[PDB]
Amino acid sequence: MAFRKSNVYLSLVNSYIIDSPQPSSINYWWNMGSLLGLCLVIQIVTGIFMAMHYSSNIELAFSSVEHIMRDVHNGYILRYLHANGASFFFMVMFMHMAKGLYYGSYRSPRVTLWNVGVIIFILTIATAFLGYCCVYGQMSHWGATVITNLFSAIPFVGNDIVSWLWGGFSVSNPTIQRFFALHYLVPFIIAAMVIMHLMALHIHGSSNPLGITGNLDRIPMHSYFIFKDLVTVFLFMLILALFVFYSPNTLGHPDNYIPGNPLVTPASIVPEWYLLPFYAILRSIPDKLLGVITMFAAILVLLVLPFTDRSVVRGNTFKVLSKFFFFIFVFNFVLLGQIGACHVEVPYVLMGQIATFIYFAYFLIIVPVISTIENVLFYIGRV
Amino acid sequence: GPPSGKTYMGWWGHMGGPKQKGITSYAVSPYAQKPLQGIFHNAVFNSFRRFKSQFLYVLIPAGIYWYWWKNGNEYNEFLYSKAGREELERVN
Amino acid sequence: SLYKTFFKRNAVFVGTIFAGAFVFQTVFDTAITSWYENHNKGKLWKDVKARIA
Amino acid sequence: KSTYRTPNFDDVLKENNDADKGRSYAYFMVGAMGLLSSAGAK
Amino acid sequence: VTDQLEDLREHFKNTEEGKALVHHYEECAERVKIQQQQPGYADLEHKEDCVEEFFHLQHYLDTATAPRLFDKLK
Amino acid sequence: AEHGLHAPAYAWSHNGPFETFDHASIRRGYQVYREVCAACHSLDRVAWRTLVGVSHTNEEVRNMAEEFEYDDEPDEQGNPKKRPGKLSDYIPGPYPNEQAARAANQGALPPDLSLIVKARHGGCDYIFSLLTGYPDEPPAGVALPPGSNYNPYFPGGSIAMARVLFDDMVEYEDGTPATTSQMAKDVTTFLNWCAEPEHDERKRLGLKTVIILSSLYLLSIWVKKFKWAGIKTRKFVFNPPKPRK
Ligand code: HEC
Ligand code: HEM
Ligand code: HEM
Numbered sequence: 102m103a104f105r106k107s108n109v110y111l112s113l114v115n116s117y118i119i120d121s122p123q124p125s126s127i128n129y130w131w132n133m134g135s136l137l138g139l140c141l142v143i144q145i146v147t148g149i150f151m152a153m154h155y156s157s158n159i160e161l162a163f164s165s166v167e168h169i170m171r172d173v174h175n176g177y178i179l180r181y182l183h184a185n186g187a188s189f190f191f192m193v194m195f196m197h198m199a200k201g202l203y204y205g206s207y208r209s210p211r212v213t214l215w216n217v218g219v220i221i222f223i224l225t226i227a228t229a230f231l232g233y234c235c236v237y238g239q240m241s242h243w244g245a246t247v248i249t250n251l252f253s254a255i256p257f258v259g260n261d262i263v264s265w266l267w268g269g270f271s272v273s274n275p276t277i278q279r280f281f282a283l284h285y286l287v288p289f290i291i292a293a294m295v296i297m298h299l300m301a302l303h304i305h306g307s308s309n310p311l312g313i314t315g316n317l318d319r320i321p322m323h324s325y326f327i328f329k330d331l332v333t334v335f336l337f338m339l340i341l342a343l344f345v346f347y348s349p350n351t352l353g354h355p356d357n358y359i360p361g362n363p364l365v366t367p368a369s370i371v372p373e374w375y376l377l378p379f380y381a382i383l384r385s386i387p388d389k390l391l392g393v394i395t396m397f398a399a400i401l402v403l404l405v406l407p408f409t410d411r412s413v414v415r416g417n418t419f420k421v422l423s424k425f426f427f428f429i430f431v432f433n434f435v436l437l438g439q440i441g442a443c444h445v446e447v448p449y450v451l452m453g454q455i456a457t458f459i460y461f462a463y464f465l466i467i468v469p470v471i472s473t474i475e476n477v478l479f480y481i482g483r484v
Numbered sequence: 485g486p487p488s489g490k491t492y493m494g495w496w497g498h499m500g501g502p503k504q505k506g507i508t509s510y511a512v513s514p515y516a517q518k519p520l521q522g523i524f525h526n527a528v529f530n531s532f533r534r535f536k537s538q539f540l541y542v543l544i545p546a547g548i549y550w551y552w553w554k555n556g557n558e559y560n561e562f563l564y565s566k567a568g569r570e571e572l573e574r575v576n
Numbered sequence: 577s578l579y580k581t582f583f584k585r586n587a588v589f590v591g592t593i594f595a596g597a598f599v600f601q602t603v604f605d606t607a608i609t610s611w612y613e614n615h616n617k618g619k620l621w622k623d624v625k626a627r628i629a
Numbered sequence: 630k631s632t633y634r635t636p637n638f639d640d641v642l643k644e645n646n647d648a649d650k651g652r653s654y655a656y657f658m659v660g661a662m663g664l665l666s667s668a669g670a671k
Numbered sequence: 672v673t674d675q676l677e678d679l680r681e682h683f684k685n686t687e688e689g690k691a692l693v694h695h696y697e698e699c700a701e702r703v704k705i706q707q708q709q710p711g712y713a714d715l716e717h718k719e720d721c722v723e724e725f726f727h728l729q730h731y732l733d734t735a736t737a738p739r740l741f742d743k744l745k
Numbered sequence: 746a747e748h749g750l751h752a753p754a755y756a757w758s759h760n761g762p763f764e765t766f767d768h769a770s771i772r773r774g775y776q777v778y779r780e781v782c783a784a785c786h787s788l789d790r791v792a793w794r795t796l797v798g799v800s801h802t803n804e805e806v807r808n809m810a811e812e813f814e815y816d817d818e819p820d821e822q823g824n825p826k827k828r829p830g831k832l833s834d835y836i837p838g839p840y841p842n843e844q845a846a847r848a849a850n851q852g853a854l855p856p857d858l859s860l861i862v863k864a865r866h867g868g869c870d871y872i873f874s875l876l877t878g879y880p881d882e883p884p885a886g887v888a889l890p891p892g893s894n895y896n897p898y899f900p901g902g903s904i905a906m907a908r909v910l911f912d913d914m915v916e917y918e919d920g921t922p923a924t925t926s927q928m929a930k931d932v933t934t935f936l937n938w939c940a941e942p943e944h945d946e947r948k949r950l951g952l953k954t955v956i957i958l959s960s961l962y963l964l965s966i967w968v969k970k971f972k973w974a975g976i977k978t979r980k981f982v983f984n985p986p987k988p989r990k
């Protein structure tokens with residue numbers, strides 16, 4: 102046989118990126134996965150070369166990022182390509198997490214591939230949150246205090262965990278110096294979970310937008326989806342180049358350029374645009390303990406979704422009402438992140454309760470009942 | 485090697501679909517045909533077709549949450565306006 | 577033919593890829609640099625320092 | 630219809646199929662992508 | 672040579688749209704002037720201002736005098 | 746009233762994808778920093794060497810950094826001694842410790858402006874409209890606390906920074922009129938340079954990257970279609986096999 106199939110090391114490359122049989126009719130929404138692999142390499146490579154110039158002490162943490170931007174040869178390219186690639190990483194990931202929910206990718210036999218994705222989803226939120234406090238900006242100090250003081254709601258144990266996590270009584274030198282060493286570790290755990298993520302993708306393969314069997318028409322991965330992935334790679338690196346060279350500070354917040362101060366709070370403590378919606382779910386509940394349970398459930402509610410969907414068809418393509426309420430839920434999340442940008446004032450609190458209720462009810466009431474009539478409209482409409 | 489489980493895909497030769505017979509395929513080498521052959525009449529007529537089909541699935545779902553946010557924004561503007569503090573104190 | 581000289585051997589096909597990419601590095605760099613300075617004439621440092629005369 | 634009869638591909642096909650002209654145009658486009666790519670990688 | 676924005680600010684102050692907004696500022700300012708002279712005003716814990724009216728006038732002149740300013744300035 | 750008045754968009758000369766800084770305005774803005782806002786504000790993140798070849802000539806910058814003094818390594822018996830500054834040193838602020846800043850300015854802490862442009866929402870428009878946005882009297886209805894001045898653009902209204910910009914308080918080296926609007930346009934230009942000294946090179950490396958990538962992106966579509974041409978026009982036919990077997 103051929104050497105690419107006979108060698109021990111080249112046979113793994115052969116069966117994953119060269120001879121892998123792909124469905125012949127997957128559209129551009131299936132290119133999102135390779136873009137996350139491209140962005141994972143960008144964060145790591147631009148991070149190792151930028152970790153050669155960063156000090157994790159509370160004294161030198163902020164000052165060293167300026168030295169990177171002013172003294173390192175092409176040091177501003179390093180930090181804008183790493184700060185904007187973090188924001189571009191989440192936009193592709195939401196379009197990967199939304200394409201899965203539309204075409205019913207979570208349904209069996211791909212539930213493990215769905216659960217490994219949620220684990221990957223959490224570790225990336227922590228990785229981005231941990232790397233955010235590394236800059237030790239004014240927004241990162243108080244984003245660290247609020248998020249870490251959230252576990253003080255677990256009864257009888259919270260006060261010790263918070264003191265154990267801070268390494269002391271507040272956010273000080275022991276906190277930042279251990280946040281950076283963790284931030285260098287977790288990407289190597291995500292890279293290991295992606296390997297386990299592609300291992301569960303290889304047993305059954307990708308899905309197709311029609312939601313039917315794809316074993317009838319397959320084409321090889323090389324020269325078809327290697328060159329089609331090259332189309333989106335150049336478009337992703339072009340929009341990223343516009344945000345890095347022409348408007349670097351559009352997505353971020355200007356208050357992060359102030360050194361962190363423990364005495365004076367900012368005018369408005371707001372998270373980044375990708376954690377903004379869950380901030381509204383936390384703040385909708387008028388209690389402290391109940392907020393944490395409600396906030397974390399919104400991630401965990403995705404786990405029951407393979408059970409609530411009672412449809413015998415995968416996807417929303419041939420369903421009028423199941424495709425109809427999807428975009429409200431899409432928009433409700435788009436609306437959910439809008440209140441979190443506005444202060445806690447009349448009548449944004451009332452909007453904050455109804456909107457987060459319809460968010461949770463989609464999984465637990467609408468998807469199961471509309472999916473039920475849809476089975477009946479399908480039945481008597483043909484009979 | 486050790487035995488493995490049962491999956492819903494095979495490989496080149498035993499992919500695992502149903503047996504097929506009576507279906508024929510024709511193709512032509514791309515060195516012999518002109519790409520970009522119909523990019524016009526596809527950027528105009530084909531795109532308009534697809535848009536007219538899937539555009540009430542996105543507009544009305546976006547037409548509800550735009551009027552809902554606006555009547556709250558222009559209501560929050562009156563509640564914190566000089567003419568709407570008396571309604572503010574009854575909702576505060 | 578033009579094919580027989582350039583595209584037949586993959587040894588010389590990639591050679592003229594590297595040879596053409598060698599020239600493009602310096603020609604494109606100077607072409608972009610000159611227009612950029614020309615579009616911003618009267619603002620750059622060499623124009624202010626030249627004004628001191 | 631007989632299998633031997635083949636479907637109409639006329640609107641896709643080029644009028645004059647000359648291998649030296651045809652492979653030269655394709656190679657120049659691939660060559661251009663490689664030439665700019667080598668510059669970007671450097 | 673006086674400043675190039677104060678005099679340009681005066682040109683739009685006495686325009687038809689500007690005169691209706693500066694006057695709307697004066698009608699609030701005059702009633703606050705007679706509201707600030709009444710007895711018991713110091714401990715009424717609800718004082719009416721004209722910031723809404725002042726912000727309306729000051730926002731109008733900026734939108735009118737934004738693009739015309741920098742050409743005067745070297 | 747408490748968000749602060751929104752400031753409009755002005756006609757800055759460096760906005761747009763191809764504009765560089767007006768390096769004559771960086772040279773003039775540095776002059777009105779040294780004599781107006783040098784007393785109460787700091788610039789701790791600017792070395793002396795970055796000014797060579799951007800605003801001043803090398804002999805000009807080697808003399809500006811020599812008017813100040815820096816602490817030198819101890820002498821033969823450990824006693825401390827001072828040295829004149831060189832091109833590798835930074836710009837010294839006006840106050841030694843954070844306590845001495847709050848004493849001179851009524852308790853208010855004046856910030857370091859080496860990053861002010863990217864640290865106050867309102868970008869270049871907020872610094873310019875700050876120093877020229879002071880009314881002669883506060884609006885009717887408001888009585889300011891003692892020692893504080895009114896400025897509508899400031900979020901919350903009341904501010905502790907006074908008026909420092911008048912007419913003809915500075916004389917330029919190229920005869921430009923010294924109006925309140927003229928200088929406020931210049932410092933924001935000089936301060937934007939301090940926050941982004943990579944401004945011009947970033948925008949010209951971007952033009953090179955966009956043109957290269959935009960034609961790579963187009964060339965890839967032709968190559969994608971050339972290689973996908975055999976599957977796009979592939980035609981299937983179906984003839985039902987006989988049920989004899
Ligand atoms: C008279 C002393 C003085 C001078 C001169 C001075 N400032 Fe200030 N500035 C202050 C003080 C005091 C504060 C703090 C006020 C506070 O935040 O309320 C301040 C605050 C600021 C702020 C922070 C505003 C914000 O929204 O937090 C900026 C920006 C600023 N000054 C810019 C400048 C610029 C630009 C100049 C001249 C180019 C200048 N200052 C000259 C005293 C001065
Ligand atoms: C998926 C992987 C990663 C993500 C999502 C990520 C994300 C981030 C983010 C959002 C920041 C703050 C950016 C800013 O606002 O300035 C940051 C900072 C940083 N990251 Fe990462 N990072 C990743 C991997 C790495 C790795 C592997 C390293 C080092 C080996 C690294 C080193 C750093 C350093 C040193 C900083 C501080 C420097 C600076 O931003 O100024 N990162 N990271
Ligand atoms: C760095 C992070 C990730 C990478 C590199 C990655 C990569 C991939 C790749 C290459 C595929 C196959 C190609 C495709 O379907 O488009 C895939 C499929 C999938 N991924 Fe991910 N993924 C990541 C994160 C996630 C996350 C966070 C989730 C869910 C929250 C997730 C859920 C899925 C699902 C459901 C599929 C199957 C899609 C289908 O077959 O139709 N992945 N992933």
Ligand SMILES: COc1c(O)c(C)c(C/C=C(\C)CC/C=C(\C)CC/C=C(\C)CC/C=C(\C)CC/C=C(\C)CCC=C(C)C)c(O)c1OC
Pocket residue numbers: 117118121134135136138139141142145146149150292295296299302307326330
């Ligand atoms: C199902 O269909 C598929 C599919 O199966 C696959 C595999 C892919 C391809 C995707 C991937 C395989 C993504 C994989 C991503 C990773 C595993 C991340 C890679 C992480 C690393 C490389 C680890 C970090 C290590 C380094 C890069 C070290 C680098 C060294 C440095 C910087 C040292 C330099 C110093 C000196 C001294 C020079 C697809 O795109 C795809 O759909 C098209």
Ligand SMILES: CCCCCCCCCCCCCCC(=O)O[C@H](COC(=O)CCCCCCCCCCCC)COP(=O)(O)O
Pocket residue numbers: 135136138139324327328330331334659662663666
């Ligand atoms: C994980 C990060 C990337 C995700 C995967 C996306 C796939 C893109 C990889 C690019 C390889 C494409 C060339 C294949 C090849 O060798 O074809 C070779 C030769 O083809 C060529 O002429 C090469 C063209 C040069 C373009 C390469 C630019 C790389 C851009 C950077 C992408 C990654 C950062 C085989 O050609 P064949 O079709 O005859 O078999």
